[PDB]
Every structure is written in structure tokens, then in C-alpha cells.
Amino acid sequence: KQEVTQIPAALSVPEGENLVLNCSFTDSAIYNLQWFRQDPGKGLTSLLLIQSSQREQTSGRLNASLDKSSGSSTLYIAASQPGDSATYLCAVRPLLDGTYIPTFGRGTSLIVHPYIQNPDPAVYQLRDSKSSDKSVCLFTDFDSQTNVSQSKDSDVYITDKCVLDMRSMDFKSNSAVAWSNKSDFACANAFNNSIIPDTFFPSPE
């Protein structure tokens, strides 16, 4: 019986590059194949639907092909951008009739990294507005090749990295937050992982 697999499970790529997502299915007898996009905390958005006897289907930068005989489809995303970051799922439906149950793949988790023209890695410590002696560290402006690893300390936390775009000045940057529920602890030390040697670590004072 039908079984759909998507590869890769997770794809990380620099913007500007074209992307290729694959979805294979055991049974070539399908009425149609459909690609969806899902953003964290949101539902599934339909991208493309390919009829059995159509072969190709376009939608701007999204181009989807389907080889029924081989039993596989490919989603082509041209000139990718950080906005394409999301999980991609393909689903297929039985051509049979009397049965309309589709089958979903596990999906490909995609991440398109931003182009950082001028990398300027640095960790800054911030203070709480309420002034409760609290603070947090901010690792920002690093190139998109830099990876942040979760700290190996009990009371220390590090978030994943996100991209923020300052529309007004056409400036986008990467950042990662770190803090510790420790009594008087320098959070800058939470980043003891694999960062750039030229990373700026100004003293909090």
C-alpha cells in the first residue's frame, strides 16, 4: 500500500541558490500530488497540485515535476530566500476511486540562510528594563556559516538563531539569545562553542 518519503529531512542552504526537494511514492497510480508549506505555529498552505497526467506545474519560483512511472516528484524553488524557511510536505491521492485517503510524507525542514555582506560578530550583554539585576546576552551580526550549540551548563540557556530584517535600511542580521537563571553570572560565557576568533566581547560595565 502507498508510502511516501521525502528527502532530505532537513535542508540548510545559502540564499540565492536554487533548491531541490524530492518526494517519492511507492504506488505510481495516484490521481494527484500536492505540496504544502507549514510555518511553526501555523497550518499547511497549498503550494502546487499536479494532476496525474500533467507532468509540470509552475507558481512563480515554485516549479513542480512528476514522473508517475518512476513514482516520484520534485519541488524546485528558484533563487531561494530566508522567507522560504519552513517545513515542506508532499501528499499523494489514490487514482482508484471509492478511496480518497491521501498519504503524507514526513516533510523536509528547510532553512534558507541570509546573506551577510559585512559580518561583524559580537556578544553584548543587556539589562532588564525593570532593573532587577537581570541580564541576557546577545550574539549578533555573525555570518550565516556560524553555528550555535546548546550550552553544557545546567542553569544556562541558548535559543536557536533567527534573522531580522531592518526594512528602513535594507539590513538583515542573525542573532542568538543566551541567559542564565544563576545568581550573578556572565552569560557571555554561554557561547563557549565554535564561533569566530574575531568575535567582539565588550565588558558589560
Partner: protein
């Protein structure tokens, strides 16, 4: 379109609940799925038209009915902890060619004890003087901590207007206790502006988190306030140079 309600819900093991799903597109086919980490979308029930429904891959613990073409509710008589998941409703015309349409999803968390429900503590951290001087930019950080379940919505408000420019929030919150499935969460967001906008004392920044918790109809016998659906925020004003 397809509309599911509610979008967020917290149940106590044993309670009943009905998830609604409607569409005004006149689709004869409607179905329910549940999505779980590292296990994908699994069909619960489906209906090919009014007066008819069928079991899916995992129909146990759920009931459905299709008296009208427009609606297709999912019922849970005795809520079980295992039923904690994200539920989706999908519809299409039974004249294949018409795509499948999904709702926004319903996030249901079933608990053995509602005392594991905690609201978030929110705090905004003001821009470092090192960043401003080095980049002529300022990044405010909002940190929401210790909440459970993961039913939150974080947003920034500057001078009364929700902003999306110069903002990124963690796509997903991190567990404060990695090994527990009942772990409380933390979520952060960044708001970056020009140093001059931050240095203006009349500029008002506000970070808020909408937390979906208990109802006013649930029991609660503890000294700390009941963690009902609420909004928790923190704020900060620009600071002159």
C-alpha cells in the same frame, strides 16, 4: 475557506471536548488529522458526504458526524494524555482536481493535573551601550519564561502599532527541562531599531505574549493565581544619550 475552533485548548484527563471545523466552499470531503513530532500526519476520520463518515488510521478515542456538508466536528469523550497533539481539518471537492484545503490547526494539550499549567513571566531587556556605539543600532530582547503548555503568541508594539520590521522571534520555544514532555518553556524575540529611535525618550516599546490556558469554569485550589487565558507584557521607553 476552512475554519477550525478552538485554535488552542487545555484539557484535564477525563474531560470531554468537541473540535469544530467548517467550510463554505461546498466540499463533500472532509477529514481530521493529528500531527505528532517525528510521526507526521495521521488520519483519524473522514467523510465523503453528508450522512456518512469513516475511520482512518487512528480512530480510537475519537468520534465524528456529518449531518451537514458545511461542518464536520471531532469529539473526544474521555480525554487522554496521549491525545495531546495538533489537530488539522482538511476538505476538497469529490471531483478530484480540486486541491486539499487545511485549517489553521487546533493545539490540544491533555493533562493529568492542571497544576502543571503555568503562565509566562515576561521581561524586556534594553539595548547594550556597546552595540549602539559599535553599530549605531539597538536591539531590544523580550524574554517569556516558565510557561506551560506551549500555547503562546508573542508580538511587539511601538507607540501603539504592532511592528514586524526589524523583528524575529524564535520559531519554536525551548524546553527549560529537555528530558520532560511536561517541561515548561522559554521564548525570545528581538526588535532592532536605529540608535537614534531608541535614544528618543518619547518612544514606547512593548512586548506582549498572549497565553492560552485555563477557562473561568475550571477548578483551581492553589495560592498562586489561576493560569487562565491572558496577556502578559513588559515595556520600555527610549533612553536619551
Amino acid at each position: 475557506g476552512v475554519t477550525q475552533t478552538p485554535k488552542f485548548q487545555v484539557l484535564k484527563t477525563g474531560q470531554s471536548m468537541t473540535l469544530q471545523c467548517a467550510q463554505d466552499m461546498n466540499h463533500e470531503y472532509m477529514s481530521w488529522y493529528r500531527q505528532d513530532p517525528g510521526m507526521g500526519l495521521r488520519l483519524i476520520h473522514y467523510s465523503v458526504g453528508a450522512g456518512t463518515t469513516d475511520q482512518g488510521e487512528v480512530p480510537n478515542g475519537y468520534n465524528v458526524s456529518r449531518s451537514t456538508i458545511e461542518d464536520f466536528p471531532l469529539r473526544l469523550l474521555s480525554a487522554a494524555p496521549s491525545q495531546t497533539s495538533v489537530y488539522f481539518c482538511a476538505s476538497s471537492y469529490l471531483g478530484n482536481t480540486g486541491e486539499l484545503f487545511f485549517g489553521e490547526g487546533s493545539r490540544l494539550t491533555v493533562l493529568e493535573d492542571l497544576k502543571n499549567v503555568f503562565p509566562p513571566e515576561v521581561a524586556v531587556f534594553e539595548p547594550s551601550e556597546a552595540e549602539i556605539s559599535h553599530t549605531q543600532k539597538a536591539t531590544l530582547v523580550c524574554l517569556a519564561t516558565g510557561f506551560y503548555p506551549d500555547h503562546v503568541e508573542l508580538s511587539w508594539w511601538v507607540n501603539g502599532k504592532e511592528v514586524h520590521s526589524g523583528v524575529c522571534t524564535d520559531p519554536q520555544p525551548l524546553k527549560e527541562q529537555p528530558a520532560l514532555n511536561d517541561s515548561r518553556y522559554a521564548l525570545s524575540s528581538r526588535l532592532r531599531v536605529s540608535a537614534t529611535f531608541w535614544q528618543d525618550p518619547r518612544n514606547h516599546f512593548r512586548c506582549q505574549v498572549q497565553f492560552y490556558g485555563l477557562s473561568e469554569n475550571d477548578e483551581w485550589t492553589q495560592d498562586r493565581a489561576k493560569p487562565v487565558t491572558q496577556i502578559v507584557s513588559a515595556e520600555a521607553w527610549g533612553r536619551a544619550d
